[PDB]
Amino acid sequence: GITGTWYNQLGSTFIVTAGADGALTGTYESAVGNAESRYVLTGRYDSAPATDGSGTALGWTVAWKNNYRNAHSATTWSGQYVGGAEARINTQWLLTSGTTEANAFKSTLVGHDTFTK
Amino acid sequence: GITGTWYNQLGSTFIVTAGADGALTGTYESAVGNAESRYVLTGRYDSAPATDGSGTALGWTVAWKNNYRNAHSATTWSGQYVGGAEARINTQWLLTSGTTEANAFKSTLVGHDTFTK
Amino acid sequence: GITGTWYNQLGSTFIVTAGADGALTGTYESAVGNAESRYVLTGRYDSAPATDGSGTALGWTVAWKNNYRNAHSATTWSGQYVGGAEARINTQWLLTSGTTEANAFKSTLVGHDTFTK
Amino acid sequence: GITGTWYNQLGSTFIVTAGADGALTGTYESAVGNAESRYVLTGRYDSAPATDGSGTALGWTVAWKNNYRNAHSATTWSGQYVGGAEARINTQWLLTSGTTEANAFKSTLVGHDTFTK
Ligand SMILES: O=C(O)CCCC[C@@H]1SC[C@@H]2NC(=O)N[C@@H]21
Numbered sequence: 282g283i284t285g286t287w288y289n290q291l292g293s294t295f296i297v298t299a300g301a302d303g304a305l306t307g308t309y310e311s312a313v314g315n316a317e318s319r320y321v322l323t324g325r326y327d328s329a330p331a332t333d334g335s336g337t338a339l340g341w342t343v344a345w346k347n348n349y350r351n352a353h354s355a356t357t358w359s360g361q362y363v364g365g366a367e368a369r370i371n372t373q374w375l376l377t378s379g380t381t382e383a384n385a386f387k388s389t390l391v392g393h394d395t396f397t398k
Numbered sequence: 399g400i401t402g403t404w405y406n407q408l409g410s411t412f413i414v415t416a417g418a419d420g421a422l423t424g425t426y427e428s429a430v431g432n433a434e435s436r437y438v439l440t441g442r443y444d445s446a447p448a449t450d451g452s453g454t455a456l457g458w459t460v461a462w463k464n465n466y467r468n469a470h471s472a473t474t475w476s477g478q479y480v481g482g483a484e485a486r487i488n489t490q491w492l493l494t495s496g497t498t499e500a501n502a503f504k505s506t507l508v509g510h511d512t513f514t515k
Numbered sequence: 516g517i518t519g520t521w522y523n524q525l526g527s528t529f530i531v532t533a534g535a536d537g538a539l540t541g542t543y544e545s546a547v548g549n550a551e552s553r554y555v556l557t558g559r560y561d562s563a564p565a566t567d568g569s570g571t572a573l574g575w576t577v578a579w580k581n582n583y584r585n586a587h588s589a590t591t592w593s594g595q596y597v598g599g600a601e602a603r604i605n606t607q608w609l610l611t612s613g614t615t616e617a618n619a620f621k622s623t624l625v626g627h628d629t630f631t632k
Numbered sequence: 633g634i635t636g637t638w639y640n641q642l643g644s645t646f647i648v649t650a651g652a653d654g655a656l657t658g659t660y661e662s663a664v665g666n667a668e669s670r671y672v673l674t675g676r677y678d679s680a681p682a683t684d685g686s687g688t689a690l691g692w693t694v695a696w697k698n699n700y701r702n703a704h705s706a707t708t709w710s711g712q713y714v715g716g717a718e719a720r721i722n723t724q725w726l727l728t729s730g731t732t733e734a735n736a737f738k739s740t741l742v743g744h745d746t747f748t749k
């Protein structure tokens with residue numbers, strides 16, 4: 282049940298489609314940051330996970346360039362899909378910015394987002 | 399600039415193609431871990447970077463299931479490309495595994511990879 | 516308002532004293548992992564934070580060895596303290612284990628802990 | 633053999649002292665960022681590590697406030713010590729700034745440092 286619309290604790294919107302070959306496709310809208318409207322994403326996931334009750338591993342990427350603006354940055358979300366009464370996706374993310382060699386030490390932010398429907 | 403074959407410090411081979419629309423397609427082979435042979439990747443990149451000399455931000459994802467085996471895991475690489483005499487892709491990554499909720503605290507590994515020609 | 520007893524979402528107990536010298540001293544009890552009983556901690560914090568409302572930056576370290584056990588690992592917590600009606604300490608952590616360099620790529624877990632009163 | 637002067641790939645200086653009880657004490661100077669001169673550090677380490685050839689786990693913290701300035705920030709380094717002809721300390725670090733509740737998503741940087749003599 283990964284396919285569908287999800288929201289994280291910041292109020293961002295994540296619209297996902299789960300391919301039977303393990304593909305991920307959709308749209309992302311950030312409530313925060315140097316962004317506006319939708320941005321394209323793509324990723325992959327385990328299409329044959331364990332049935333001992335483990336969650337489903339997954340990942341996806343967004344580059345913050347669209348028709349309206351460029352932050353010159355990209356984010357990847359890595360985490361696992363969890364089912365049951367209340368399904369959620371728990372992730373941790375990295376946000377890298379394009380920088381000069383001078384400032385590369387401070388190019389990457391880390392954090393975590395939690396998504397539900 | 400990005401399209402082509404790259405190798406990281408572990409012996410792993412990353413074979414990429416960067417579409418002009420910001421898309422990333424290719425193959426990945428890991429020198430290490432619960433893997434063998436090639437795996438499909440996909441990702442995104444800033445197809446309109448700065449002219450001030452900044453690097454080119456990008457990211458990509460790999461789910462470790464192919465026709466030979468399934469580790470039930472996925473990695474995302476977030477970083478930026480740097481060109482010139484010595485071209486490199488400098489990244490940090492997240493490797494998340496499918497876990498029970500009891501062990502979810504130990505579900506995600508962190509690291510860094512450097513890619514060169 | 517840092518000194519005192521805190522608990523995180525795992526049910527771990529974090530007992531801290533904030534000295535005026537920017538120092539952090541205390542004990543830690545983990546509800547999870549290769550652990551039993553208390554372990555020593557020590558850290559640092561901004562003893563002169565902004566008055567604009569920003570949080571209080573801080574961090575602390577724990578090596579998992581005590582009279583009862585040795586897990587051959589260490590965790591660092593980095594975050595900020597936030598006061599008011601409901602005070603919290605928001606962190607991200609790095610848990611590193613001793614390994615052979617062949618397995619060095621799988622040496623480091625990343626996570627986040629939330630601490631309340 | 634953790635005690636001694638080390639430098640990272642940025643040319644920052646790490647002056648460390650390992651107490652017999654698993655304590656770490658010393659000074660830190662950053663070649664970069666919002667800082668100048670020496671800053672106090674404290675941390676812990678595994679004082680009875682495995683003999684199978686694994687590295688020694690360790691960690692330490694620095695709050696970026698001293699007699700000359702205050703960044704309102706702290707960094708924690710988590711990693712392990714590795715001995716031999718090329719003795720090194722391999723780390724990943726987290727750098728957190730004090731922020732408002734609104735800007736917390738951009739409060740924490742991650743990277744990696746390599747220390748040698
Ligand atoms: O500021 C940028 O460079 C682009 C916007 C970044 C928004 C980030 S991605 C991680 C986090 N989760 C969200 O929903 N928004 C922020």
Ligand SMILES: O=C(O)CCCC[C@@H]1SC[C@@H]2NC(=O)N[C@@H]21
Nearest residue numbers: 408410428431432462469471473
């Ligand atoms: O072990 C697994 O479950 C999957 C194999 C992952 C190996 C990792 S991905 C990050 C790092 N870079 C590599 O080239 N290999 C490792």
Ligand SMILES: O=C(O)CCCC[C@@H]1SC[C@@H]2NC(=O)N[C@@H]21
Nearest residue numbers: 525527545547548549586588590
């Ligand atoms: O090496 C071990 O197995 C013990 C690690 C302790 C469990 C971790 S430390 C980070 C996180 N926060 C907690 O309260 N527990 C886990």
Ligand SMILES: O=C(O)CCCC[C@H]1SC[C@@H]2NC(=O)N[C@@H]21
Nearest residue numbers: 644662664665666667703705707
């Ligand atoms: O917050 C600041 O502006 C001062 C901190 C300086 C950044 C650091 S800590 C990680 C990295 N390693 C190092 O030696 N210097 C930078």
